[PDB]
Design a protein around this ligand. Sequence first.
Ligand code: 8OU
Length: 266
Amino acid sequence: YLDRKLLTLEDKELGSGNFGTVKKGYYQMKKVVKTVAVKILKPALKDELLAEANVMQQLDNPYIVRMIGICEAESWMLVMEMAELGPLNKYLQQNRHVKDKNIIELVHQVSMGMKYLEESNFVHRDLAARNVLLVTQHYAKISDFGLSKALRADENYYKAQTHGKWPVKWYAPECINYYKFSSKSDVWSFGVLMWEAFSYGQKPYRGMKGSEVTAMLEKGERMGCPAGCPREMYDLMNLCWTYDVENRPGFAAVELRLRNYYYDVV
Ligand SMILES: Cn1ncc2cc(Nc3nc(N4CCC(O)CC4)nc4c3C(=O)N=CC4)ccc21
């Protein structure tokens, strides 16, 4: 595991995730230094960070943030690779010149990242543009597995005991209504992430309470098509927002439509 001495931290906080506060740092490997991002813990919580690390340790995919390791000194610390460009929603906010086909590339990468996660039977549970990190303008990685769960070999959903404070605007009806989280409910979140991407990092359901969003969806109402969003991408959003879980597509089908659409547009 990781040694505090070989870890240097800058003291400005880059932002906050589910169980901590992310800071830039430098970690000396054998010969070189790796620039890193370090989630630092604010009773239970230690277990939560450790659990997140336990999830990350089992994941190896090009489109998922790699964990370097864990560090236990002064605070409990989860050491990750640094995605220099930061979160997708902030980047697109500040980079309105980013081309529609650039955004397709990036959301397609998230869908590859998520297809892997679906094949691996892990549920993300907090998929949102804020937790997509940009290594480069054409390379996105999924992060923050603080809410993630390893599914049982006999089940395709995790059932939460209660509702703790949740990112309700990214949650499918069955998560809100029944606390049932599956890869299919990550697909719902992905659609909201797509809406975020093609709206250049604008928040979904602006000015509405979680309760008003739920009520809007149960009417069969959905968010509109963002300015300049290609119609095939907006169609996929609505598919992701299928109310019935069973009819909603899985990430294999979502990634396939993203892949064909992206490859079609050269
Ligand atoms: C310009 N900017 N603004 C924020 C920002 C953050 C990265 N920071 C990163 N930031 C976070 N968080 C802060 C922002 C929140 O939206 C999500 C939690 N997590 C990670 C990194 C990271 O590089 N690697 C693994 C995990 C790098 C650049 C950033």
